[PDB]
Design a protein around this ligand. Structure first.
Ligand code: B1I
Lengths: 294, 298
């Protein structure tokens, strides 16, 4: 049950150019990246645009606010810096990650950033911005075209290019075998499973647990309690006109939602009451439609 | 860093009698056994008691909730029965007893069986019927470990009992690991490839010695749920002293040595491995039993 509420659109523009969405830490703001590298803040209540910040010189591809509301990670498409860390408590650049096309925070304590440059993962200290670790084992590389390195929920492990790393020893534990060209995978928020495209792997024994065909070429996001998984399939619009929900315990579908328009991105708020979806109104005119979750 | 978050005692008792603990399937709720045979449910953050159940007429030594929240194993000191299986669905009720076993745990992959230990002997039981399916003891291969604790491997194909590897389907001993200590019988690595018997790390394929880790000596070793950290409390009334040790599960390198300067009765982690609960007595080798639960954020 996804009940459309409202639309956020770019004020003072013929066509809308939203490319990515994230709710602010305490959800008073929807943060919308644009195709020209602006970060626009919208009040969820009033629907009004409160600020437009010049973050990058190309389309924003990724946004992640820190849980404490003090920091924001951004990634763009081309040029430099590809990724940056911003203070949210005046809006200022804290550090740049010049060559990393994707960045995420550590999960348990958000003291670190993990960046991806092709097949290579970099870990940075938030305070200093210094590079602490480079994770790349050329013996084990899968060369995934959409590789995105990520920490597990405890920050002890990293998944990079389908390879599981022990962060403390900076050594590869296991290479998961390649069965697609693009998707490198994520940790299940439950901490026990690795989800790589259609393959569900046991984190501890590395045995295959499940095949989930409906996840093929999907971006996967979880609700904040990790009971529901969202998948939007990659096809310019990154995804198509539908997303799918899955029970995160058994990987069985809950709903296929056809919005009848190409999806650029989707995110949930911390309380799992809202779904924001970037939808192409044109045939870009990419608006952000808000849905009640339920 | 282990950051103390909360401390609490057994509510309203002159002397606090917590002896063991395990996190519930419910996020912020810890189950605790007591020296008078009660099972307590506490809010681990507020320290407030929620529920109490009468399980045994002697001290609870160990408890293990099932992953699905439906079942609980308990073991007591000198009660009859020594161990029992409880339903927690609607009414809290005893399903089955394991008369002679001083320790019990669930099978690992599918929790459809219980494995109990009586000295050097392992018993395997069906959860549905309570029926004893197997008695595992080989008089030729016994190591006679004083703190023997029989266990299934991650896939439930194998059992380690008194340092002997058993094929469960055939109920035959397939290998005896040579004895290097008097007490510690060992556990499976959650990766399913290694057996950890006191200071010895054995390869499950070749049965070759992979590593010797002196810092593990006389430790009850447990893994966090993710299998990234090994926690060891050393034997020295509590069986344990005032220290617990952590090791990297991938390379067995020590991480931390934590001396709480009080005897430890038990320790456990939450399903998300964010927290460590420790039961500690309030001087060293205190005759007085007055324990607290301390919660650390990891
Ligand atoms: F050295 C080992 C090796 C393997 C397992 C253990 N454990 C298994 C769980 C139970 C442990 N024993 C106790 C005993 C105990 N007390 C309660 C008070 O009366 C004395 C026994 N309190 C807590 N734990 C021993 C010890």
């Amino acid at each position: 049950a996804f009940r459309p509420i409202s639309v956020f659109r770019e004020a003072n523009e013929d066509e809308s150019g939203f490319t990515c969405c994230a709710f602010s830490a305490r959800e008073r703001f929807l943060m919308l990246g644009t195709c020209t590298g602006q970060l626009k803040l919208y009040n969820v209540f009033s629907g009004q645009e409160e600020a437009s910040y010049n973050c990058h010189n190309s389309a924003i591809t990724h946004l992640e606010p820190s849980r404490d509301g003090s920091l924001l990670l951004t990634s763009a498409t081309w040029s430099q810096p590809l990724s940056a860390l911003w203070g949210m408590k005046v809006f200022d650049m804290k550090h740049s990650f010049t060559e990393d096309h994707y960045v995420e925070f550590s999960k348990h304590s958000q003291d670190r950033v993990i960046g991806t440059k092709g097949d290579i993962a970099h870990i940075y200290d938030i305070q200093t911005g210094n590079k602490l670790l480079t994770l790349f084992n050329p013996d084990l590389a899968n060369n995934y075209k959409r590789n995105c390195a990520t920490f597990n929920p405890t920050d002890d492990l990293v998944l990079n290019d389908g390879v599981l790393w022990d962060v403390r020893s900076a050594q590869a534990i296991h290479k998961f075998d390649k069965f697609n060209m693009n998707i490198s995978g994520v940790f299940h928020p439950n901490g026990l499973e690795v989800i790589i495209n259609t393959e569900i792997w046991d984190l501890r024994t590395f045995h295959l647990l499940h095949t989930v065909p409906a996840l093929d070429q999907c971006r996967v996001v979880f609700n904040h309690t990790g009971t529901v998984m969202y998948g939007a399939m990659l096809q310019k619009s990154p995804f198509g006109s539908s997303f799918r929900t899955f029970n995160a315990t058994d990987y069985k579908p809950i709903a296929t939602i056809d919005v009848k328009r190409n999806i650029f991105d989707l995110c949930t708020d911390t309380k799992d009451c809202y779904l924001a979806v970037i939808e192409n109104q044109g045939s870009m005119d990419t608006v952000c439609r808000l849905y009640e979750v339920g």
